[PDB]
Amino acid sequence: SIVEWKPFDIFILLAIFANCVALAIYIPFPEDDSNSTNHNLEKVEYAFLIIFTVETFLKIIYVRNGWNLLDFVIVIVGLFSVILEQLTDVKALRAFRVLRPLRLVSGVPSLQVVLNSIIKAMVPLLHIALLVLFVIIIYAIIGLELFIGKMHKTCFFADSDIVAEEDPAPCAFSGNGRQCTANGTECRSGWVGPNGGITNFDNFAFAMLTVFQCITMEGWTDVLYWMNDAMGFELPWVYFVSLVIFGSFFVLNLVLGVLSGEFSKEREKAKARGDFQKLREKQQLEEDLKGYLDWITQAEDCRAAVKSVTFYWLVIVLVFLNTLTISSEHYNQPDWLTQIQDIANKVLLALFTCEMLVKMYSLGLQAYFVSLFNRFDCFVVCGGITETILVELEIMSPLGISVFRCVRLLRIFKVTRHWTSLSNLVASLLNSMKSIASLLLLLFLFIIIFSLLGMQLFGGKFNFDETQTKRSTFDNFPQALLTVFQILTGEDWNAVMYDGIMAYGGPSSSGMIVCIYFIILFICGNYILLNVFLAIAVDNLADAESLNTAQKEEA
Amino acid sequence: IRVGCHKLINHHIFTNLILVFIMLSSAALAAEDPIRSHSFRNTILGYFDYAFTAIFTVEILLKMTTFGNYFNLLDMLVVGVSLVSFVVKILRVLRVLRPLRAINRAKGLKHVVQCVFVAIRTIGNIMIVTTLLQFMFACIGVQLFKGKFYRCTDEAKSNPEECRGLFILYKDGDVDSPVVRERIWQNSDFNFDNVLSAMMALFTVSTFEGWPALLYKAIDSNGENIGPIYNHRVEISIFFIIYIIIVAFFMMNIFVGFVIVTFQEQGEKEYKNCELDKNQRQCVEYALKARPLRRYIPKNPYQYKFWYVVNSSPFEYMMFVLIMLNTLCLAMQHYEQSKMFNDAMDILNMVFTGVFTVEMVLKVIAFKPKGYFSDAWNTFDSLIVIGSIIDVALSESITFFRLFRVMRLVKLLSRGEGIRTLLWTFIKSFQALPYVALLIAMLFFIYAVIGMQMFGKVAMRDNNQINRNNNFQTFPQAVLLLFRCATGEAWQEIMLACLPGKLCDPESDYNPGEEYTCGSNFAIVYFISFYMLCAFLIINLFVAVIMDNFDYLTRDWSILGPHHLDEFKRIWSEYDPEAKGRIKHLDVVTLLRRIQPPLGFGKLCPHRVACKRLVAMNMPLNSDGTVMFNATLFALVRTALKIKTEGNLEQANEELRAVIKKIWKKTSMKLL
């Protein structure tokens, strides 16, 4: 319509962020419970729907672009969800609201290009994915043939349906495996399974799920031991050891090699542009300024001691003593050591601040604020001198003692100044901090989106055991975020998957279809991590390595 | 006369005999019973060591006769320990140094060990930084969770003054099944009491194992000496999140990145780019290392009819379809299937094995069976059907032959351009570096033997991590435990299970009265050192394998590659029924017409550009229909790369004899 470009596109982005916050505040109560916050948030969501529809109809002139396609798909599915909710799994139709945070990347081109690069860096991995698919299928069929329905025989009591031990394990199938020998115990069929029936090889879907669980090096030993108990003792080790080596060690080598060979392609292409020269030119004049700032000023504007060789080692000894005092606290420490620590802190703070005031009034006030190496030293000294008076005055702050010891602990970094190798990488890291922050923000957005989706799906649904409370749930936003992070690191993600499967019925029924949420989250989440933290390392280490070659030859 | 001893020690067979004796002695060491000290097997094995330690004794003296380095001192150290052994536990532990004696013998082992040491030295900067970061985080964690990880046996008493006496426990939450249990105010297994404990806990967190439990234990931490509360401070998880992001995601990926970049820079010592770059060095060589092939076209057209029938695109696509169908029919057998379902499966299996046998007989008739078995794929499927065809009458041991029919899907993996070559390249690279995995094998051997000697007497129970499936009582089982820890499954749990206060199995010859003695404080350093060493060695092996074939990983398919030359050779062989050197020039125009533009010529008229270019460039002045394989392929390669003018053609020969490897008299006709 009428020209409205600079205020409109940032106001709508602020609206997106506000909608993200509103979605984060919502608490998924179990069994249709609610409070006042959700009662207000439904009207807030209404208002967001009307504003989104208004701004969509304002700019229709638009559908061919994929981003705008998703933009109005979200609006139309939200409208349909509202209509169906008013005219009454209708509540699950609002799970498309989780894609609204994804609209924020369209508002920032600087992050849109990063997302596009990450997505485009995925095509070479399709061969490895296909190979993994064949490996999984082949091993699933092999498991189906070798052992089907054999982990279904635990040891109950005498003429009863109650299992003997609280951690049941299968008996032998035909007198070869484990034998349950207790006071009164005979073992027969009729058992449900090891993980409630979720981990077994008595179906193609079950076999594929078990093989995918084992190929990620998570809980493969549990399956191996269960098969050792159920079947014999000589075959199962050949199946699982080879599956881990070929399926995981070999494939992780496949992915890492392909990624390494892909980063080098773009490193040797942007090098022809002159990106390394920009960093080299900036760094080559930093050594030309330090000399042309002291020598040109040392003539007419204590400096003998600070530039000596004894002063540096004395400061090293002082910081070593500071570290020793810091790293000596423990539970039930002797009463004579607390006083030693609290007087050593005082005297060493006084000595460090005396040294700092000597340094400040020996070379120049305006020549040290520019350098970042000594810029936070004044903050550390001020915080240390503030802590003493804060504690001794009428402010106790029992937790404040443990928060002010960290800034005093950071003084250990004073030993890592003259390295010429640590600082060389730090220079490149500071140069590329903008790309670093962009990648980290994209990772954070991905985590937030998956946390919101998990809150929508499994929110208030892990209350099915009635005997214990789960810690890795999706009850609220911080807990969902922690759970998504844990699944991302790949630690006991199978337990969360089993809980999510049982939350929708069990191994039977159509509840197992939700397992693709954790399969996608692990595969897609781990790909991003290997394309973010590895890319930061690779493209900032070759830059530092090449600087040393230029710096050494020019020296 | 100390020259005969020199001849003996330097003899061709003596070094091999010494090496095989060393490996046999190591194998004997890895077969001793760790539990039963008074066992018959150990007595026999001890007799074996007596002869083995005498040969090693008679060769050091024999070598000492002819001489008058640090590796020789190590050899004397190992022999000395055995003689002194004849306390004793330390000598028994030091007996594991036998495999190290083979380092000085095999050159490859020495080279890989030196490379590993160099890699360790060049990466020491990062290790110091990450160790300092872990130390800082351990100090912060000590300040934050000092003594707050305590808890009582029952979650009803929240201070030590209340956690005394007995209490009623309701098993599994049932109110009608109570049992009396003691109240113990016990600390957590991994805590932040002092700096060492904090460092250990943070190491376990950084290994991405058991970290959620520590997270949810730290979230509940109330105070100095009182019990936890459910979700007391969720915001304390920021410490764990920040630590994980900074160390395990950043300082650990920077480790692998630094290894990769160091290997890549070290391998770039090929400073021979006086006239040719990396692309020329990668493309021209395949011209030299080429050997033509024939099509194996048969005779007797009555037999060639079947050959024409078989070798066709529709036949291959049909076999693809039926192999996928057989795979689908295999992978839909469920549990407790119906009798009719099983009967249908049996009939369908009979049909599929019959159609595959028909395939086999048709192909063996049509493809001249003398050379039919020459190919690897053709022999592979023959074994599949033969094992499958004998089970049809056995339906009414056998399980082994069933797995054969699954392998037909593997042949479908080599049906795509790129997934087959990726595998080919990486298995070739693995085969090219066999000594790198030998370091991992030696590490596993040494640590398994040490685990036997140290924790081999810990009793096996059912509720603990040292169970019937996981212990140090046998070499396969100890190696399996080490593999499980390398994967990092519950390695810290086993480490905790190996502490001194553990029950011993009632089979070792221990002093009566005391049975909670086996286990040692060596477990912590043992497991931590093994994890670090195995992770480093695995990273080193992975990066070495990746760097061995790095040209393929950066192929840049747009410019050129060996695939283009292979396609050229395969298309050419169609017009060359035999590889007898010289070929016919009649259909060269159509041959180049069949080639892709990057190597041949485009869709435009060949008479305007291609025909001019074929004759304009210098060619050997041979006969009308005589021209060698190299005389065409190398000429095409030189046409595609660094095109020059006339007069300086002998510069190509100069480059071949100077920069390229020895011509080996293969360029006599290529001089023209």
Ligand SMILES: CC(C)OC(=O)[C@H](C)N[P@](=O)(OC[C@H]1O[C@@H](n2ccc(=O)[nH]c2=O)[C@](C)(F)[C@@H]1O)Oc1ccccc1
């Ligand atoms: C010890 C086990 C794990 O065996 C190994 O691979 C070696 C002994 N050490 P490692 O620490 O193993 C964990 C990393 O595997 C990455 N992974 C997996 C699948 C995937 O699809 N994507 C992906 O990134 C990760 C999930 F990111 C983890 O950080 O190997 C590293 C290799 C390169 C960079 C960092 C670590």
Ligand SMILES: CCCCc1oc2ccccc2c1C(=O)c1cc(I)c(OCCN(CC)CC)c(I)c1
């Ligand atoms: C042979 C001596 C070098 C072994 C070694 O020492 C170190 C000191 C500080 C930091 C790392 C090392 C180190 C490693 O090689 C090493 C250690 C770890 I922990 C490590 O990461 C553990 C595996 N992984 C779990 C998924 C971490 C993310 C890796 I990769 C390499």
Ligand SMILES: [Ca+2]
């Ligand atoms: Ca794990």
